[PDB]
Structure 1
Amino acid sequence: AAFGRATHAVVRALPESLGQHALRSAKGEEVDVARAERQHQLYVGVLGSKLGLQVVELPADESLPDCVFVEDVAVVCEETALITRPGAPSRRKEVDMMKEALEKLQLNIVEMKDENATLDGGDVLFTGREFFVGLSKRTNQRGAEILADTFKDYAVSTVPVADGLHLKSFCSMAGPNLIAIGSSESAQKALKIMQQMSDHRYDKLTVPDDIAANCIYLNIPNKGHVLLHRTPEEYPESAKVYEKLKDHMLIPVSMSELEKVDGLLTCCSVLINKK
């Protein structure tokens, strides 16, 4: 029953249409869809092959350029699964194949139908003891409330998010009571507004680069602490910090191509503890 304990992961293959048609907050370089396919296969390979997780791998839909970012379509807590209503109208038909696959895992599904409420999963931080929900261009106040009710079991608190990002675009959990946090002003501000709002003090793992604050933390059997982090070729100074976490089974994972379209590590799966 440890924080980070998982048995299944839900992942979705990226469509060829992601190369040219995936939403991306800024203009960047060309997407090597092949390279992004490799990088995705290596991501899924760690979770399933190396870490023993049962992986649910959904088929790529071409008409949904962003289908590979499954995090944004669902939020799982305990045995309940909140099916979101993404900020991006064009992204809502990913809900459908995720819904149907969460049904095969026997999860308690609650759907966000409220035509006014929006929520991207990436805007949701779950520390194990409460919820922090980002308010952004993808997630609204009304979306936060529906989440607050689905999991009445947990305290929800909201924090304001800048630019064209998610809350987890600069943070995530690095272990039980350890939030990975970016060094930027925007990230520090966010964290401090989160700190004041809880009846608990979280330890902080501060890293130079905000994007590299987005890692995946798992507590898998016989292994203990496991952490997938952005590779040293990508963010060397951030990898330096993780490297110090000695009781953690550090796995470097590349996400350079998908990053072009604002894809980070957490975005690409939904983690599930089936007891």
Structure 2
Amino acid sequence: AFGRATHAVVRALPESLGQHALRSGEEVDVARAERQHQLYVGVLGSKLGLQVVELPADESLPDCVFVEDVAVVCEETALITRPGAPSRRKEVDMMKEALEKLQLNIVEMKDENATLDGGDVLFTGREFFVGLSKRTNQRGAEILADTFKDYAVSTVPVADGLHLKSFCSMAGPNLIAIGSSESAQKALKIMQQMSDHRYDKLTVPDDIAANCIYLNIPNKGHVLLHRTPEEYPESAKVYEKLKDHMLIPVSMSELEKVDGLLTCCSVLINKK
């Protein structure tokens, strides 16, 4: 069942993030980001009842909170990535430990010519879309392709120093949340040509706000964490039409300053 999860790996942000985290804007309020990430953890863990493994902040790694970038997980198989940003590679160490406690099958992307961000991987439930970006390359998607054999993998040129999931993400089975920008619409279509099947599409006015979290919770159903009507009111209005979804607005303004979206701050795990 798509978007069904039992666990989630997250990680506390270090104080060094406000000043030291890679980006591309306002000064970051660390107190505010702190809070926001707390709320974010509670929605998944307290409100939604997933077992959360919280990793401790490594001050040394100001980007460490964005855990999605370091691992892709599908069924019982963990891909531990080789992040495009050289400096962020020391964040895999601590994630591999955790994914080992979860008794998950590990594969490490060690190939020295292979970069891959999890931020660049869209998993539709039916297949894989990997974005070819400034951080994820051919040699990485091929290894991602090689790790998840039961699934078809195809690559979508993502430009402009972004990621694939900066303008899209799954908002339900067969439903792909999508930005209006011509960048996104382009990849969107590029994506469909390549599928053995047609996806439904949820379009939203703000590229960033098409990054959301869909979940299939036991005795809850469709669940979507999405950006607030404050941050992105015209996109919130679009999510508001999803009347089969338990809609939980989740703010993420601070982290966005450093290119942090909703999906980046967790790795989701379905366990028997």
**1:16 equivalenced with 2:41 (yes/no):** no
- Quick one: distance in 2 between partners of 1:251 and 1:148? 33
Q: What SS does structure 2 have at the residue aligned with 1:36?
A: helix
- Quick one: distance in 2 between partners of 1:68 and 1:138? 18
- Quick one: distance in 2 between partners of 1:98 and 1:166? 21
- Quick one: distance in 1 between partners of 2:134 and 2:161? 7
Matching residue within 183, 190, 193 for 2:190: 193
Matching residue within 43, 47, 58 for 2:44: 47
- Quick one: distance in 1 between partners of 2:58 and 2:111? 25
- The alpha-carbon deviation at position 144 of structure 1 amounts to 0.4
- Quick one: distance in 2 between partners of 1:245 and 1:125? 21
Residue by residue over 1:31-90, the C-alpha shift from the partner in whole angstroms, topping out at 9 and shown as x without a partner, is 000000000000001000000100000000011010000000000001000000000000
- The alpha-carbon deviation at position 193 of structure 1 amounts to 0.3
- The alpha-carbon deviation at position 255 of structure 1 amounts to 0.3
- Matches of residues 169-180 of structure 1 in structure 2 within 5 Å? 169-180=166-177
Partner of 1:131: 128
- Quick one: distance in 1 between partners of 2:19 and 2:197? 44
- The alpha-carbon deviation at position 258 of structure 1 amounts to 0.2
Residue by residue over 1:125-183, the C-alpha shift from the partner in whole angstroms, topping out at 9 and shown as x without a partner, is 00000000000011000000000000011000000001111100000000000000000
**1:61 equivalenced with 2:62 (yes/no):** no
Matching residue within 236, 249, 253 for 2:250: 253
Partner of 1:4: 3
Partner of 2:67: 70
Q: What SS does structure 1 have at the residue aligned with 2:169?
A: strand
Residue by residue over 1:113-134, the C-alpha shift from the partner in whole angstroms, topping out at 9 and shown as x without a partner, is 0000000000000000000000
Q: What SS does structure 2 have at the residue aligned with 1:152?
A: coil
- The alpha-carbon deviation at position 238 of structure 1 amounts to 0.1
Residue by residue over 1:186-215, the C-alpha shift from the partner in whole angstroms, topping out at 9 and shown as x without a partner, is 000000000000001000000000000000
- Quick one: distance in 1 between partners of 2:30 and 2:42? 18
- Quick one: distance in 1 between partners of 2:110 and 2:81? 8
Q: What SS does structure 1 have at the residue aligned with 2:8?
A: strand
Matching residue within 161, 166, 178 for 1:164: 161
Q: Deviating runs (4+, > 4 A) in structure 1?
A: none
- The alpha-carbon deviation at position 18 of structure 1 amounts to 0.1
> Which structure 1 residue ranges, 5 or more long, are not aligned?
none
Matching residue within 235, 240, 256 for 1:238: 235
Q: What SS does structure 1 have at the residue aligned with 2:240?
A: helix
In the alignment of these two chains, the number of paired residues is: 272
- Quick one: distance in 1 between partners of 2:127 and 2:242? 24
Q: What SS does structure 2 have at the residue aligned with 1:244?
A: coil
Q: What SS does structure 2 have at the residue aligned with 1:240?
A: helix
- Quick one: distance in 2 between partners of 1:176 and 1:20? 39
- Quick one: distance in 2 between partners of 1:79 and 1:220? 18
- Quick one: distance in 1 between partners of 2:49 and 2:13? 22
- Quick one: distance in 2 between partners of 1:190 and 1:230? 22
Matching residue within 93, 100, 108 for 1:103: 100
- Quick one: distance in 1 between partners of 2:106 and 2:60? 25
